[PDB]
Design a protein around this nucleic acid. Structure first.
Lengths: 332, 106, 186
RNA sequence: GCGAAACCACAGCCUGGGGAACGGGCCAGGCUCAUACCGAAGCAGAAUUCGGUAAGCUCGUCGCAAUGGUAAUUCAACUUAGUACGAGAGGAACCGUUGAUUCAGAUCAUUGGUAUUUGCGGCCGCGGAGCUAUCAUCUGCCGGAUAACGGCUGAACGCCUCUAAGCCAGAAUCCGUGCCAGAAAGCGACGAUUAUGUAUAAAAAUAGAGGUAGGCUACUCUCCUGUAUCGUAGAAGAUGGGCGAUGGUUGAUGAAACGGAAGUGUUUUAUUGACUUGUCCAUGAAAUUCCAUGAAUCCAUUGCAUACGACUUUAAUGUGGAACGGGGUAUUGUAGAUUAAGCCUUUGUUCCCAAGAUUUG
RNA sequence: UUGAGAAGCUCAGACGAGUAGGCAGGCGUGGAGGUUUGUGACGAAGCCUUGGGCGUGAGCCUGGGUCGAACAGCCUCUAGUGCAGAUCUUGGUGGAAGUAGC
RNA sequence: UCUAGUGGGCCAUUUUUGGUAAGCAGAACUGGCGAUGCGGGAUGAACCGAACGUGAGGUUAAGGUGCCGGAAUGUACGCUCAUCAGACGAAAAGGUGUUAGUUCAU
């Protein structure tokens, strides 16, 4: 409790991470996304040569105890227009999607089954019946706006979680003009967004999230800083855990699933440190507010070997396939 | 449009008071449009009234009137002293008043 | 003299104490007072002098908005401990800039509070909005941006009104009735 | 379930001043060792010292941020450069690296244990998961304003002159900033949903501005407030005849445009409806015969949680969930059992349920 | 002109803090003598009342309700005669408290 | 002639003698409060006015007239810029601090 800033330490109400401060944008910057909702797939120590001129580990093999985040693609079904006012930053209007997925419709509700599935139905009528009204809303946004964000939601069904309400949160469309921001939002409407496009594996990411409660330590929304990305592995990619050095094919998921999380079947990212919250918890990955110019972010990442052993218990083999031939024929 | 308004608009400011003692018997009335004590001499003796409304109706009318008469000027800024048939309530500070043109000497 | 049910006051170039005293007296008169452009209020004295005056106040809630600075001065000149002074405060609306509802309404000024008519020439004075910029207010830049936008639209309306006014002014002397019986001073 | 007694003028936020206490009643208000920075000093440089500055150490869904706390925090070495300085040696600013911390932020992957898998093999030998760690692995700020401090330029003092005008440089400080909350009595967007004329919009200087007009250079006029301008006549405004406008005043709907900020109102009208005191007439209004006028919650589920609720999904006929039957799984351990319990997972099975009530205009 | 409760009526002027203390006149209570050819089961006394009135006041008169057997004004006599206090006396009853607890 | 109560002081004024770190102390002189409310003095028992039946009207005292607050954001001159004014002892002085300047030198 030394840090007076956190005192009085009280648990964050919203489990989902909140992007309180988006990075500054400019017209020259292309329209793109900063914050990406994700889940704590797990964490695993992986070896990597440390390429840093002037460092004492310069071109030296060092094991990197790091963390892997489950990041399913990002479907966007809404846009918000924020207009700057003397009182503050006010939302001019919200334009959701003509067709909303079941998951995002579950978010608006507390339960899906008891209700008569009436979430945004009459809206879906006026959107389809009168597209010109939506055009006026977009026209109103373009003429009067400085900040434009999108109401993108997660696909829970792709994730191995009992969660069914799609986690939704505004993401600024940084770059370009407001009209250009709206044009990109309108064309990417009702479309998924992959985190691999958002982060180039070398860009600077400050992960924000809510930590794990303890029997007011825990459920604290805390913004981690200086956690560089090393690999955005795809779910369909069977070579994500097998880099150039370790060409032996393997999946980031340890055999028998991650510890207290499950298996990973979607896009995942790679970063060091520890993220606030245990496995299978909602996390937000956003671009850094400040352009961190330290050589830790500047240095290229050439990961040497991913580990996938049975972290639960004591795993002596990272993948079953090699252990089949390495160890003798089983009695079965 | 154009109403009737055969009176002059006025406001109830306060009672004839010292720093800590009030005298509700005399009320200080600001006849708006009058700016000096010499100008206030025209309105001396005129009939001033406080028109208000009550939810209960009497004889089919919900409007009640307290009548008064302007007595003398108060200060150099044209405020006058008025005595009403019933002392004006303390809650009518800042409330509007009507100063008639009668009795007339013009 | 004559009053109005609601009054919109332009606080550009008005001294803080002088305007607040007149406004507080008008509020106790039952009038409804709306003060716009609260960030252009002027206070006599060097900007160093008022910075330390506000800094001493910083050392309750320390409001930073210029509108809430003006409301504080008005609040101190009212019997806020009683109901009469409580109702007076609710009849005042102090805002920065000119919001749309009061944009198209006449804005009067108080000569008893104007800085030009009350301050000795060459005296140093500080602007409340400028002073509040380095105490915590962070909307001065945007408030100015809307102000120029409003001025351009307001100027365009004035040109339209002036051009329209030229038509009646030209036709005013066209009618012989004006010259025929102008003996009444009209 | 049975059940006291002490005590009891009345009360119950502070801050000051109130002389005698006065706060509980009254009156006015709220509710500088080091280091960072430089300056001076022979201070050769290193080593530094001193000087200050400096207290850092309805139900929701999704957002904005008024207000606070507070971005880090304490210091180093190598590189820099093994050199500017310096006879040389020792050792420069700045750069990167290695860091040592504190505190905070995390997580149990690495890490060691604790460990109700108290699981297992022989009370022991230990222990997976989970959690924890200066017991582990780790991550951790900003740009200006300026202080001291020294300036440049420039008056008074035709110059000079950190300064009186101005322009500055320069701080671990301050403010911003970032983070942490979020005004229970802040706000926005979005979804579903049982009186007396209440008459007037430039901006701008004022120590000069605007209009007006010519082709920013030359013009002119006005200001000197609104005691202005618009509007105003009728049994509050009648009935007709008109003439004259054949216009004006508007109501009604049918409308398109503009107005983000808090646009919620400005116009443009299209047609129709009437009114018209614009100039006139003919009747009429009085004896009141002097003022009174469908969702959500609970619920079950749920652990992701832990004073208590809260918290957290799921959950109201289908990836339906909840349970097991398990598999996987590692553990201990000599292969076996537990086999997720905060290990994963199930083309397996059955159960219940197209809920049960409450709340809600 | 009737205005002689001569203890009445009437005219005029001045004046108005007040502790200790001094003085005067009044209000109320129990009982006694006299009186009101007094009041009362067609309702005495008592009590209740945001009913009304009188007096500077102590107090007094009265309406309504309740009630059920006695009671009052005037002159005089008399005294166990007037309460907010005495860590007063007796009785009733509260907050603390459904607390401490058993 | 006889007959109740008082038979403390505080503060203030003046006078005072010595004092003596300096303050102060000591007496005496005189009234006010002590028996006394009222307007002002932010407030307050010693300060400024004023001493009291119940009221209507008028006019003032002391003090006030930007707002709280009744009453001129009155007039006519000036002084003051503070980056701690002012408003109601380190205090002596210093000031490339002024304002008015005077006087004397040229």
């Amino acid at each position: 409790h030394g840090s007076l800033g956190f005192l009085p330490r009280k648990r964050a109400s919203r489990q989902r991470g909140k992007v309180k401060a988006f990075p500054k944008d400019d017209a020259s910057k292309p329209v793109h996304l900063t914050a990406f909702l994700g889940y704590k797939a797990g964490m695993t120590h992986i070896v990597r040569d440390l390429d840093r001129p002037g460092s004492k580990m310069h071109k030296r093999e060092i094991l990197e105890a790091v963390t892997v985040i489950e990041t399913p693609p990002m479907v966007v079904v809404g846009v918000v227009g924020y207009v700057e006012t003397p009182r503050g930053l006010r939302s001019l209007t919200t334009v959701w999607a003509e067709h909303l997925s079941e998951e995002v419709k579950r978010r608006f509700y507390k339960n899906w089954f008891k209700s008569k599935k009436k979430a945004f139905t009459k809206y879906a009528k006026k959107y389809a019946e009168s597209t010109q009204s939506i055009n006026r809303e977009l026209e109103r946004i373009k003429k009067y706006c400085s900040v434009v964000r999108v109401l993108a939601h997660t696909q829970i069904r792709k994730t191995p979680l009992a969660q069914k309400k799609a986690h939704l949160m505004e993401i600024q469309v940084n770059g370009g003009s407001v009209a250009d921001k709206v044009e990109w939002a309108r064309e990417h409407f009702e479309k998924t967004v992959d985190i691999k496009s958002t982060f180039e594996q070398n860009e600077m990411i400050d992960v924000i999230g809510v930590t794990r409660g303890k029997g007011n330590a825990g459920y604290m929304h805390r913004t981690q800083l200086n956690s560089k990305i090393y690999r955005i592995g795809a779910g369909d990619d069977a070579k994500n855990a097998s880099t150039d050095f370790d060409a032996t094919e393997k999946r980031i998921t340890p055999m028998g699933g991650f510890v207290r999380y499950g298996v990973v079947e979607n896009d995942f990212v790679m970063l060091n440190g520890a993220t606030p919250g245990p496995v299978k918890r909602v996390l937000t990955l956003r671009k850094s507010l400040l352009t961190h110019t330290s050589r830790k972010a500047l240095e290229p990442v050439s990961l040497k070997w991913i580990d996938t052993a049975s972290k639960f218990g004591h795993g002596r083999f990272q993948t079953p396939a090699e252990a089949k031939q390495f160890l003798g024929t089983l009695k079965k | 449009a154009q109403g009737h308004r055969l009176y002059v608009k006025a406001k109830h400011l306060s009672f004839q008071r010292s720093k800590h003692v009030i005298h509700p018997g005399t009320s200080i009335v600001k006849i708006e449009g009058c700016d000096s004590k010499e100008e206030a001499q025209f309105y001396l003796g005129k009939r001033v009234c406080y028109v208000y409304k009550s939810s209960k109706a009497v004889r089919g009318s919900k409007i009640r009137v307290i009548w008064g008469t302007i007595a003398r000027p108060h200060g150099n800024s044209g405020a006058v002293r008025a005595r009403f048939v019933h002392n004006l309530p303390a809650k009518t500070f800042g409330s509007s008043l009507r100063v008639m043109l009668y009795p007339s000497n013009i | 003299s004559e009053f109005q049910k609601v009054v919109v006051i332009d606080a550009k170039g008005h001294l803080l104490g002088r305007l607040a005293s007149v406004v507080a007296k008008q509020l106790l008169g039952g009038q409804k007072v709306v003060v716009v452009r609260c960030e252009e209020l002027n206070i006599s004295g060097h900007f160093f002098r008022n910075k330390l005056k506000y800094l001493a106040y910083l050392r309750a809630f320390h409001f930073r908005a210029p509108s809430r600075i003006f409301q504080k001065a008005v609040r101190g000149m009212l019997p806020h401990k009683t109901a009469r002074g409580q109702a007076a405060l609710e009849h005042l609306q102090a805002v920065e800039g000119i919001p749309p509802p009061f944009d198209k309404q006449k804005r009067v000024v108080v000569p008893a509070a104007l800085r030009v008519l009350r301050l000795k020439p060459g005296r140093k004075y500080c602007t409340v909005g400028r002073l509040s910029s380095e105490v915590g207010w962070k909307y001065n830049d945007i408030v100015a941006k809307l102000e120029e936008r409003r001025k351009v639209k307001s100027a365009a309306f004035y040109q339209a009104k002036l051009a329209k006014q030229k038509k009646i002014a030209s036709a005013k002397e066209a009618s012989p009735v004006n010259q025929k019986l102008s003996q009444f001073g009209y």
